[PDB]
């Protein structure tokens, strides 16, 4: 019902400690498998961290808050989801004796974590090394880390070219002190949406800038190519309409049947005159188009395209500029579809297609995926989004950080040295954060079979003397250099690992009481 | 414990009474107070509210937590009604009201062991409550310290400390405070209500953020289109024509194509559309309007009449801006010239009186400055800075910081908070308790000592020691109130508050923490209304 | 907390004992005494229960001495008759011909409610209403004859007595409603004029033009035949009992009764059917065949007057020998909590005035008579002999529980205030009592605390009858 | 550190129980392995009685709560669909490999080296797998050698008395439907029908197809030689 005193602070720590201690074995390429026992006879043997956290049922709300962080962290970047949870859970474990045994007020710890968050991000920027994002050969080697050891390893050469051309397609590089820094505005979800086309070849798969539609020309004789096409978008379909009020039509006399037939031709023609007012070269309707409107717009010198999804029309407005209009009578002439490159209807894979593409970069596009079968397209789909997510973190900033625990130890060494010069009450919890930064590479040591006491102490001494790029190898298990042996990770993962873990750890310390009620 | 199953007094339900029900009332209000104990003040922290479904929510608002809090208890539901009374009236301060009533019940139960009758406890609170409001009314003061000191500046400075705007906020607070102070108007029958939304904030790319200028009047963002027109005209007096109807050549509709197969239709449509737009301009130059604002734009031929007449036209005006111009310039927005069967601008009826309209040259975008109209009192702020990305965050934070400033000024009678109300009234009731006496002095002493719980628990969430701060807070007001009634002072200064940001005791009047009279008076009076109703229950009959 | 889950709170002993749901049969008698205390005096339902418990506590000592409860109950009869006779000697005789004393008595009863400054017009309302219905030597006057009408809208200062009568309902809003009638005769019709609608399953199906006219002619003729019998009896105004099940008055009947110049007021509340049959001096009509002129009333003018938004109907000049001035008072106010508390405040003011009409005279409240009567019965106990003489001493000590409890509930010292009453009441007579305004013993007559003598008379009378009905129960057995 | 309606084993006890539970299934399937094995009888509870020496057929009928044996049953799912025989041998290789590693786990050896040591030995076993194998000719005259191959499969599941009866039947069933070329063979062309009330030693091979409903009439000829089918 209610939790008071200092016991609720322990309950918040044990809630995050219970979730953290389970996924400790999910870190690294050598991560051990986990066996989940469902009430049904089935079981889940996979070691995927995001798949296990979704199948775990927890009681205390702080454990659910850690699961909500994993749902957001998994959408930002592909990997490192459990790294944030383990880091956020260890900070609360290292600060547990300071918050409880030392009788320190939680706001003092929370205010200290805000300073330690900025101090930890400044160290990562100094440890990271510059990288060339404009080199096509260098980006293919950076994406290859997320390609190999997968079903696409045979197509890895074609996968790196498909992923590089896909990231370069959606991104727009702009910066200035005038309107600000957009930070390249890279969105994988909406604008990179792909259309899987059965047949063809994996190498034949191209990344096209525009909206790809599966609907062909609706008239047998019509112009299939327009030099300078003009796209017009609208909602209300082209067909015979009815009155908005109650309409009762009872026709008895033989001469009363032709009255509705004449109105049927007039109501369809009035909708076509509203479209031709701007004299468009193309007509694209969200819903279907009757055969009557096909002939009325045919005499106007424009192509008719019906049955277009609403989610596509939102992306068409980016490649065209036509403003979405509901009623055809409200259609403005400002909706012209100018700057549309090619209308080519050329068929691909025994299915008639249409090209809305152009020569410009709206930051909207539809990737054309082709392969040996539909099952191959599904394997390329999920692997392409993970390949672009790694390439996205590289394009958001020209910096790379050493992995395998080198960046984790590089922050802990600089944090312990900087906290000695502050000389304040916050100095004690800073050492707890530095001890939590050392547990991530120590976790890799425990999974590698090496001595966690001996290897961690010797690895820390190498940072105070040598460089900060010396991590732990997964295959070997001995202290080695990450840069020389080719182990690297982008900084954006390290930026979201330190920021989201500390911010979530502060929110868990802010709740000293659990309120029960609806 | 838990008195039940009485062998006598056969009834259709259980019946409790005595010290058992009086102890349950203290334990009930203690658990409810502990829910809002950590949420008191801005230094408070949010809590989790878990339902029976298993979902939850996280919010730091003490009013939303008590509404969703499940409490089964006769006195506990009284505090729920007390929480709804503060939310429907004041809307803020519900957390502090519950803590007051909770400490009163704990000290009233101690008077039971002192053999004090509860009616005397109730009467002792009612007599002290009437005289406490009188003492609160004596320390009330209007808005002061605007000249020679800085108050509203520190209000906007603390509100901007959480945003990037807080770096230059020292220079930015001078523009928001000086403006809003002069924009105040009496509305109807001397209301003197500060406007909730005014002083339209613009943006510019020039220089740094410290170059932002405060214009003594309204400033619209737009250009003059053709530069053949003078940017400064009619210095002494100028009239501004506010027109929503366009001066551009009138078309039919956006969906009507012009296709002329009949040469009679070409001459009819042309001269008709051209004859109406010239008639609209003819009624302007004849009305003596030197400034014309059109929302849909102005054509090139219709603008030529304004060039020879030195009339400044503007194309594509914002409709939401011109509706406020009509109030500031005394003009009226013209929807259409088609009123009745005639066509004309109603000269001097829709034209507002103004002093001078001059275009000041600014970096990047250039605006139109309007100063000293007939009756305006308003102003405008044009922010020049590094980029719009920062100014967009500054403009949203400026309106949010303006919200904190306009609420403090909206109430012409304010009192310093942060512990000034609880500590000053505590010391006063200590010496005032002798003026009544007759078994009621113990009730006043417990009522006064119960006021220290508000600053106490407030300093707990700030990690500072509440025993030292609350104690020293009394020593500062005690020595300050010794020579105060004598109308002579040396070192005596009252109204010392508690600043938890810097961790020191300073005056809240200069610090920028002020509360209206409606907030403190209704919070103290209603807290006793729920406290008395709990003390009046000596028996609980439950089926 | 009720079994249904409703949470209510109040200090009124009448509302507590009603919702207490006592299953103890002997303790249920205290609820009936509180009902008789409110029906007769109207005030003192809390003190009459406490006085009963003191006599039961004093009877416990009598049973310990070997005294049979029959003598205990019989001695309380002579003790109650003597306590009232002593109370009449100290009572200050007042008459109904003085209108200044009645207003002050009603104004003090209205000062205990949220409405205070607006009671200036409320005090003569209750006074003038009773003086018209009091006549002389009327003994008990039923306050049910005074109908307090609660309508939303207006203000407190707007009130109309309308001594003749006031209805609860509006007039016909359909086509043809007269809304006013002059020289009217008002009957009470429990019947309802509707086309035939049997309680079994019925349906109306018109497949042809001949079927439509067949249904219309049968309905219009059946409604007209009822309207024709009403005109033959010269009935100007009709009151139809409200029934939401079937149709009360058909719209075709409204057009028929409008052509015959007969005012129609339907949807009359069933609670007022019993009230309107008494005050108006009319008789209930079950069927139209027994509906005649002899059961009607006489009304000079019947009109619909709307102060603000109410559209309430009033009738004046009943002009009947059997019907007497039954008064219906209209109470108006803005908020719903106004007309409610005002109705209960004026109801208590009518109870205090009702006490003066049945029994003239008043006494000073605040425990003043309880102290002096206890002192006199202690001295008069020497005139008795035997077992009864000891009961007079215990009966006097049992009368001191009311003033002692008043000192305890007010925060004053129990033992100290009670001794101050015995000290001051020796030299003075009924000049001192307990008052919570001065927080001590002062003069209740100067503080405008006035308790009518009938309240203290009925409280002692009902106490002797309650304790009697208790002690006479020697056993209880299950009887089905 | 627990959740309601949940049970969990920590440290190395979770692995030791999984190995011990796998050792229980090993001892069950250790007795029936090979031609000298035993014939197990299972009872569903509805009155069905099945006697089968195959490993997978027994695992499908048995219900096991141990999640380790569930993966063993799932491991044999790909064995019958590919190999078709030797599912009991695979289980004995999984169980003993856990017992031999159990001794090294108690010594403090990290399971990754134990896991990597098995994968490295697996790759070296595949190199020795191609060296130890014997290349057999594709000629169709190897039926004499196929008789010894048929005995390897038959002697395991029976008492060896029915092997000599089923040796010519099973061997000639595959070679008859298989024309001589590279190609492949389809076992769907071989139909299996059964009839009761006779001894198992009377099992014979049918070159053609067996039909269910026969002609009923006393004058129909029983034996007809060289007839035209319509």
Curated annotation (Swiss-Prot), chain A:
PROSITE patterns: TCP1_1 (PS00750), TCP1_2 (PS00751), TCP1_3 (PS00995). Keywords: Acetylation, ATP-binding, Chaperone, Cytoplasm, Disulfide bond, Nucleotide-binding, Phosphoprotein. Its main location: cytoplasm. GO terms for biological process: chaperone mediated protein folding independent of cofactor; protein folding. Disulfide bonds join 359-365. SUPFAM superfamilies: GroEL apical domain-like (SSF52029), GroEL equatorial domain-like (SSF48592), GroEL-intermediate domain like (SSF54849). InterPro entries: Chap_CCT_gamma, Chaperone_TCP-1, Chaperonin_TCP-1_CS, Cpn60/GroEL/TCP-1, GroEL-like_apical_dom_sf, GROEL-like_equatorial_sf, TCP-1-like_intermed_sf, TCP-1_chaperonin. PANTHER family: CHAPERONIN (PTHR11353). Molecular chaperone; assists the folding of proteins upon ATP hydrolysis. Known to play a role, in vitro, in the folding of actin and tubulin. In yeast may play a role in mitotic spindle formation. Belongs to the TCP-1 chaperonin family. This is T-complex protein 1 subunit gamma.
Curated annotation (Swiss-Prot), chain B:
This is T-complex protein 1 subunit alpha. One of its GO terms (molecular function) is unfolded protein binding. The keyword tRNA processing does not apply. CDD domains: TCP1_alpha (cd03335). Keywords: Acetylation, ATP-binding, Chaperone, Cytoplasm, Nucleotide-binding. Belongs to the TCP-1 chaperonin family. The keyword Magnesium does not apply. GO terms for biological process: chaperone mediated protein folding independent of cofactor; protein folding. InterPro entries: Chap_CCT_alpha, Chaperone_TCP-1, Chaperonin_TCP-1_CS, Cpn60/GroEL/TCP-1, GroEL-like_apical_dom_sf, GROEL-like_equatorial_sf, TCP-1-like_intermed_sf, TCP-1_chaperonin. SUPFAM superfamilies: GroEL apical domain-like, GroEL equatorial domain-like, GroEL-intermediate domain like. Heterooligomeric complex of about 850 to 900 kDa that forms two stacked rings, 12 to 16 nm in diameter. Molecular chaperone; assists the folding of proteins upon ATP hydrolysis. Known to play a role, in vitro, in the folding of actin and tubulin. In yeast may play a role in mitotic spindle formation. Pfam families: Cpn60_TCP1. It comes from Saccharomyces cerevisiae (strain ATCC 204508 / S288c) (Baker's yeast). GO terms for cellular component: chaperonin-containing T-complex; plasma membrane. It is found in: Cytoplasm.
Swiss-Prot record, chain C:
It is found in: Cytoplasm. GO terms for biological process: chaperone mediated protein folding independent of cofactor; protein folding. Disulfide bonds: none annotated. GO terms for cellular component: chaperonin-containing T-complex. GO terms for molecular function: ATP binding; ATP hydrolysis activity; ATP-dependent protein folding chaperone; unfolded protein binding. Gene3D superfamilies: GroEL, GroEL-like equatorial domain, TCP-1-like chaperonin intermediate domain. It holds the Pfam family Cpn60_TCP1. Signal peptide: none annotated. CDD domains: TCP1_delta. Keywords: ATP-binding, Chaperone, Cytoplasm, Nucleotide-binding. It comes from the Eukaryota. Heterooligomeric complex of about 850 to 900 kDa that forms two stacked rings, 12 to 16 nm in diameter. Belongs to the TCP-1 chaperonin family. Molecular chaperone; assists the folding of proteins upon ATP hydrolysis. Known to play a role, in vitro, in the folding of actin and tubulin. In yeast may play a role in mitotic spindle formation. Present with 5530 molecules/cell in log phase SD medium. NCBIfam families: chap_CCT_delta, thermosome_alpha, thermosome_beta. This is T-complex protein 1 subunit delta. It comes from Saccharomyces cerevisiae (strain ATCC 204508 / S288c) (Baker's yeast).
Swiss-Prot record, chain D:
It is found in: Cytoplasm. Coiled coil: none annotated. Molecular chaperone; assists the folding of proteins upon ATP hydrolysis. Known to play a role, in vitro, in the folding of actin and tubulin. In yeast may play a role in mitotic spindle formation. Heterooligomeric complex of about 850 to 900 kDa that forms two stacked rings, 12 to 16 nm in diameter. Belongs to the TCP-1 chaperonin family. This is T-complex protein 1 subunit zeta. It comes from Saccharomyces cerevisiae (strain ATCC 204508 / S288c). The chain holds residues 5 to 234 of 546 of the full protein.
